[PDB]
Amino acid sequence: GVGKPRGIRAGRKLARHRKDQRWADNDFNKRLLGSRWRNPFMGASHAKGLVTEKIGIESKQPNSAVRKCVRVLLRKNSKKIAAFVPMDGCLNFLAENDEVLVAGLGRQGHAVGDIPGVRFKVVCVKGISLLALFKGKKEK
Partner RNA sequence: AUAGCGUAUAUUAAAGUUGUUGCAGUUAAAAAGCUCGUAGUUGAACUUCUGUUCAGGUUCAUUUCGAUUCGUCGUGUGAAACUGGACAUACGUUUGCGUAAACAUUUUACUGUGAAAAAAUUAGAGUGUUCCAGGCAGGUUUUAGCCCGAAUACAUUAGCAUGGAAUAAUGGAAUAGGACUAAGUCCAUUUUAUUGGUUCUUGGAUUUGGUAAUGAUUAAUAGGGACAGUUGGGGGCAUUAGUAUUUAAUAGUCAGAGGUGAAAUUCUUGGAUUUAUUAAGGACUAACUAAUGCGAAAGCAUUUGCCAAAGAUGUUUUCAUUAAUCAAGAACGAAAGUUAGGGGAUCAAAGACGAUCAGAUACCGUCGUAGUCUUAACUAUAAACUAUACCGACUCGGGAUCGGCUGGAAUAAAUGUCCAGUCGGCACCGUAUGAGAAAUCAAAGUCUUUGGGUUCUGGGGGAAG
Is 15 a binding residue for other proteins by CB under 8 A? The answer is yes
Give which of Mg ion, RNA, other proteins, none residue 109 binds (C-beta under 5 to 8 Å, depending on kind): RNA
Q: Measured from the CB of residue 30, what is the shortest distance to Mg ion in angstroms?
A: 10
Binding-residue pattern over the window 105 to 134 for RNA, x denoting contact by CB under 7 A: xxxxx-------------x-----------
CA gyration radius for the chain?
A: 22
- Whose CA is closest to 101, among 48, 41, 140, 60? 48
Q: Is 31 in the site for RNA (CB under 7 A)?
A: yes
Minimum CB–partner distance for residue 102 and RNA (Å)? 8
The size of the chain, in residues, is 140
Number of residues that bind RNA (CB under 7 A): 35
SS3 50: strand
CA distance 90 to 74: 20
